From Swiss-Prot, chains A, B:
There is a cross-link at K5, K90 (Glycyl lysine isopeptide (Lys-Gly) (interchain with G-Cter in ubiquitin)). Cleaves the C-terminus of replicase polyprotein at 11 sites. Recognizes substrates containing the core sequence [ILMVF]-Q-|-[SGACN]. Cleaves and inactivates human TRMT1, preventing tRNA guanine(26)-dimethylation of tRNAs. May cleave human NLRP1 in lung epithelial cells, thereby activating the NLRP1 inflammasome pathway. May cleave human GSDMD, triggering alternative GSDME-mediated epithelial cell death upon activation of the NLRP1 inflammasome, which may enhance the release interleukins 1B, 6, 16 and 18. Also able to bind an ADP-ribose-1''-phosphate (ADRP). The lineage of its organism: Viruses, Riboviria, Orthornavirae, Pisuviricota, Pisoniviricetes. It comes from Severe acute respiratory syndrome coronavirus 2. This is 3C-like proteinase nsp5. It comes from the Viruses. Residues 1-306 are cytoplasmic. Residues 1-306 form the Peptidase C30 domain.
Amino acid sequence: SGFRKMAFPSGKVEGCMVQVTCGTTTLNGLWLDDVVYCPRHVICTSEDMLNPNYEDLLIRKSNHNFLVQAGNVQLRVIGHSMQNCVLKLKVDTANPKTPKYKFVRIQPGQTFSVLACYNGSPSGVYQCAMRPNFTIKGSFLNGSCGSVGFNIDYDCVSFCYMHHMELPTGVHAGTDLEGNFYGPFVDRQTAQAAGTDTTITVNVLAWLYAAVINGDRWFLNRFTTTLNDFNLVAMKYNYEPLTQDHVDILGPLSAQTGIAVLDMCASLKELLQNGMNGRTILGSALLEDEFTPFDVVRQCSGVTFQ
Amino acid sequence: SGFRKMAFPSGKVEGCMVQVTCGTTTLNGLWLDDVVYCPRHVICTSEDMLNPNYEDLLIRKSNHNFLVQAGNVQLRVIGHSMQNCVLKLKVDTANPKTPKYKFVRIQPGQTFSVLACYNGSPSGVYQCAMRPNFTIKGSFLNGSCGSVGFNIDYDCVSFCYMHHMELPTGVHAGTDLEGNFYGPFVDRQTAQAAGTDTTITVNVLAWLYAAVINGDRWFLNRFTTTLNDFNLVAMKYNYEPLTQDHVDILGPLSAQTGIAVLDMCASLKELLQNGMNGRTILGSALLEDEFTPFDVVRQCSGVTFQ
Ligand SMILES: *[C@H](O)[C@H](C[C@@H]1CCNC1=O)NC(=O)[C@H](CC(C)(C)C)NC(=O)[C@@H](NC(=O)OCc1ccccc1)[C@@H](C)OC(C)(C)C
Ligand SMILES: *[C@H](O)[C@H](C[C@@H]1CCNC1=O)NC(=O)[C@H](CC(C)(C)C)NC(=O)[C@@H](NC(=O)OCc1ccccc1)[C@@H](C)OC(C)(C)C
């Protein structure tokens, strides 16, 4: 038993992580087969970052402007081509460590793991989520750009994120691997604000089942509510409305525990209307929304990967 | 900026993780050079687990009783020898992926990362700490035994933990890599209880500096206390006494911020005597003790590894 914020093993992504240097700019890039994906503001300067027209800047460049480096060994670039906000550098060697992989575009609510890098050398791995406001509460310093988020389903790596920029409230933003930003942010230095966040309700309920599975049960009650009446108190507390499709995915968990989904909504209801009054759930003094219903199953029934 | 519970990249440990099967018992084992380290109750049965005399059980065994398996390929055992609570299986091949490594025995307070495995296939990676009561608040299911905790200092892996058993309050216990249990627990199924936990004070203060570095500052104050007078309120709240050696390691952080260590003790003091009254620090409604003063430096000044 026990329940920790857990991350996918990062071995397979470490094998693709390289250093990309251009001008006076060094960031990280992802090397799959014979292609190296990095963010395109690697071609910018400090003065460029104010309102670049990346199509112009890029057309001046030649191949030899791109110092790519895997470990110490220098990759030879032989092509480039900008797709949305990522650059695609065709080099002269395919990555021997290329794993099974795909590119995906996640929805808000879905979670993933992040391997933070600087100069191509991994530094850490955390697990976080795609906020309702298309931001992520991450941990990034200068040079952290080009690091990726990802899920692993047995042998296959689903890349879903690349890092580009920090917003002034300390939150972060970036794109899928096809270059398209999540949310309405642009890779340039002009003011822009995240937009009010909400609480991912379906993930809170998934987490509350994880609390039940692990012996925590003080928050339960006899009460039951109908979803119409839950969603009017959840709004008030600025939670995502709950769809019948949420209740569907929560069924399995509802039956490993014999607690009706509609009863667990009645407990959360009381938790919001009274708070938590000195106690913790799963060692957290807060309701926790960064665990998906399929996250809970993972950790509580022990799925592995290879 | 930003601040997440972060884990070392697990690539190098994944490369050593193998399956060890004996009798009707399957657990995970660690293969470095030509030696495979697993926990010894892999030789037990269900009835044995009540009061085994591992020296007897082991002397009946032959080499061919140990089904070792790295991926699908069957390692050939050619020797064994029990050192404290770990078995050491000499096989006929050295691990091509053996990294630079060492074995260490951590103190309470120090943290490490955990790569949870089942049947040899990694499942997740989390970061946690060696509680003051020689337990760890981990997340483990059946078959999780033989998984390790570890730190990485540039290129070198310091193994400090192997998994053996869960305690009935949901907490966990295990050994260093030389077989010796942390704390007073034994690998057998007879009753034993963790002992009251405390709060690792030096790590709370390290974390509070991380809060300062990242813009959170509502808990600060003009006040200052002398350490004699701090330690009498910290006791009350069942915190570790603070040594002058703590203040020493906290200096660097004290000066990236111009906050005297002795002033930060005066803020924590008020936080315990009043609680936190609706607000969060670093997105946690709690004071967080699983970040070391050298953890904070890592993440807030971006050290990498290879
Ligand atoms: C690339 O590795 C780098 C990583 C960031 C450094 C620290 N954390 C990071 O996420 N990204 C950038 O430096 C990026 C550069 C581009 C804008 C993508 C070209 N810049 C930022 O992240 C800035 N954010 C920003 O300027 O957004 C627009 C804006 C401007 C003014 C007011 C509000 C919003 C960061 C560095 O600026 C702060 C938001 C931290 C002030
Ligand atoms: C090996 O992989 C396995 C992993 C555990 C299964 C789930 N989580 C784990 O940590 N470890 C064991 O099964 C271990 C077997 C030995 C005792 C090491 C031989 N057993 C336990 O962890 C039990 N704990 C236990 O029996 O401790 C002594 C005890 C006995 C009675 C009352 C209190 C303490 C677990 C399985 O038993 C519970 C504590 C969960 C009831």
